[model samples]
Target: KAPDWSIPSLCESYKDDFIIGVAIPARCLSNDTDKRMVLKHFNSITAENEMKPESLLAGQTSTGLSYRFSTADAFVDFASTNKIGIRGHTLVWHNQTPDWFFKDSNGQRLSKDALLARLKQYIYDVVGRYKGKVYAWDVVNEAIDENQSDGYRRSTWYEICGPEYIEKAFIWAHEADPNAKLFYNDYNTEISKKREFIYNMVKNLKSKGIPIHGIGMQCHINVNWPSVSEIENSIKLFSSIPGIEIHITELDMSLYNYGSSENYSTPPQDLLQKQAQKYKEIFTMLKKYKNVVKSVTFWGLKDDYSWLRSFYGKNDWPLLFFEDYSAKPAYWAVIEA
Candidate 1:
């Protein structure tokens, strides 16, 4: 059954706490049902794929790299019309970036100087395009991996410019839009070693007067893992940075544990209950540190739209709405929190 529109709005429930956010594709806005649901429950939206480098890059031109903003522009136009806030999902990331970005005319990796120049130009164009409109930009994404010996992901960004790329990304983004908040976003942020690495990196960046304004903790977790204490520990650890803000970006709860091959025709009721309980616990913690967390954004709106279905190679339900767009047990749990 469809959810009753008369119920309390999640965005309104936490108006005094922080912004409630959701990730969406531009096409969803064309569906009246989906658009109405989003407008009613979310105050902030992130263009899940359209804002990524792959979608934004139009093509290489003789003058320079051009961009196609029609899809993204639609999102901005919607936000403006609806009076909702939007986040620039990313400017630099290892994934979803086209192969041409890393290769030159001769099909070799671009030189450090060449790549940095391209990075600066891309940031300037993209950030400048949406200057005052986007409230925050995930300036850099998934740059750290705890397993790496030096705690940095050996992505093209790091391999080409070394750690200097991160600092420069922030610098260029700030230069482009001084008013926009810049964030370093990543997943598995609740892990001990990874959390420590992020802490050190953010602190080091701030020490050098970098323009990083917040940490984007991609809370893509399972119902049973990363206990409430672990999540709280990360929240407290990141909060230690004197002036740093925390945005719970890409938040979702997998019905099954990691690496589970089990496929459920419909997630068992018990599993749904567990997911709801976990949502409550996490939201309660978020409420406790409301001042530190600026926003809490779900990775997607409903189960059918969740990326986990493809990512985990199985059917999975990892959102607060059922496939029919009805409220799930998790939604009620969150409101109770």
Candidate 2:
């Protein structure tokens, strides 16, 4: 049986603590049940993919670069209509960006100057379009590589413009929407080496007068890993930076460990309960740091639509709701926390 929807909503339960959010593809709003569930529980929404660069980029035109915002506009409309907060999933990312962004008309890599021009225009247009509505943005995503000597992901962005791309992105985003809280978002923030590197990067950027306002910890973990203390340590580390906000972006607790090959149509009850405890533990800590932690967004609405299923090429239950819009054990645990 499903838990009662009439029971307290997660957003309301943690109103004073932080904005409760869920990432979604705009299409989810088409389902009445999904719509109702989101409206009832979550006060903030991030476009899972619709707001990414690929979705917004239209092919180059005779006049200049063009963009199509119809899909992303749907999300902005939804948030506006419902009177809730919306976060832009990302503005710059190594993945899902159009090839043309880095390639010239001759298919050659763009020169650093040309690429930076494109990036500036892109940020100006995208960020300016949703200026007042978008409360925050993942200005740059997953650009940290601890294995690298300098700890920067050497993507095409790095290959051409170097770390200057990251600095320019935040500056341009702030110029476009000075009110929006810009963030550097990445996964595995609890790991020691990666955590220290990210901490230093943000601190250094801020000291240089960058407009970086927050850090996004993509808490994509499993039931048994990343003990609560490690999570707190990261919070403590980032909070030490003066005036830095924290957001738990793309948060989901998988029932299986990473690289596991096991397949199951549905998670075992024991694993579900363990997932519940993990959610409770994480939220309890988040509650204690409400001042610095502004938003906590689940990566998806339900296990049926979880990215983990396709990502791992197997069934994985990693959300607070099951397939039928029923609250899982994780849901109740989050509420109690």
**Per-residue accuracy of model 2 over 1-337 as CA lDDT, tens digit each:** 3535787898999978999999998778787777888999999999999999899998775334789999899999899999999999899999999988788766789899988998999999999999899999999999999999999999999999988999899999999999999999999998889999999999999999999999999999999899988999999999899878999999998888777776678689999999999899999999999989999999999887899888878888898888877888998999999
Scored by lDDT, model 2 comes in at 0.91
Clashing pairs in 2: none
Compute the lDDT of residue 232 as modeled in candidate 1.
90
Please give the lDDT score for candidate 1: 0.91
Whole-model Cα lDDT per candidate? 0.91, 0.91
Query: Residue 186 lDDT in model 2?
Result: 93
Q: Which ten residues in a row have the lowest lDDT in candidate 2?
A: 57-66
TM-score of every candidate: 0.98, 0.97
Name model 1 segments beyond 4 Å from true. none
